[PDB]
Symmetry: C3
Subunit: 53 residues, 3 copies
C-alpha cells in the first residue's frame, strides 16, 4: 500500500502505522480512511493529500 503526504504540512500517512489515535488502524489504505479524517499535524482534509509514488 502506498504512502500519502499532506501537501500542506508534509506529514506522511504510512498505512503500516495507520493513525490509531484517530481511529485509523494499521493496515488501512488511504482510500479507506473515513473521508472526515484530517491530517493529525495540521488539520486539513484528505483532499490536500497526494500519493507518494
Amino acid at each position: 500500500m502506498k504512502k500519502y503526504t499532506c501537501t500542506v504540512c508534509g506529514y506522511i500517512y504510512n498505512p503500516e502505522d495507520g493513525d490509531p489515535d484517530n481511529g485509523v488502524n494499521p493496515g488501512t489504505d488511504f482510500k479507506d480512511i473515513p473521508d472526515d479524517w484530517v491530517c493529525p499535524l495540521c488539520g486539513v482534509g484528505k483532499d490536500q493529500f497526494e500519493e507518494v509514488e
Copy 2:
C-alpha cells in the same frame, strides 16, 4: 447496492455518493455504515431508514 430513505424526512442515502462529510465513504452499503450514524438532514438514527426496492 440499494438506496435507503429516511422515513422521517425523506433524505435518500445513495451508496455511490456516501456521506463523506460524516465519514461514510462512497461505496458503503447501508448495512456497513457505523450504527451511530444519523440522517444528515434530520438527525434520526438508522432504524428509521428503509430500503428503497
Copy 3:
C-alpha cells in the same frame, strides 16, 4: 470470532453484538474495531483488553 474482556472492569466485547451505539456494528472482530474505541463501561482503551480463549 472471539470475545474480549476489559481487564479493568470486566466488560465483555461480544462480536455478535458489537457496540452499536458507539459505531461498532455486530459482526466486528475486535481487531477491526477502530483503535480509538474505549470500553463502554469504564472508558479504558483497547490495550487493556484480552482475548477470551
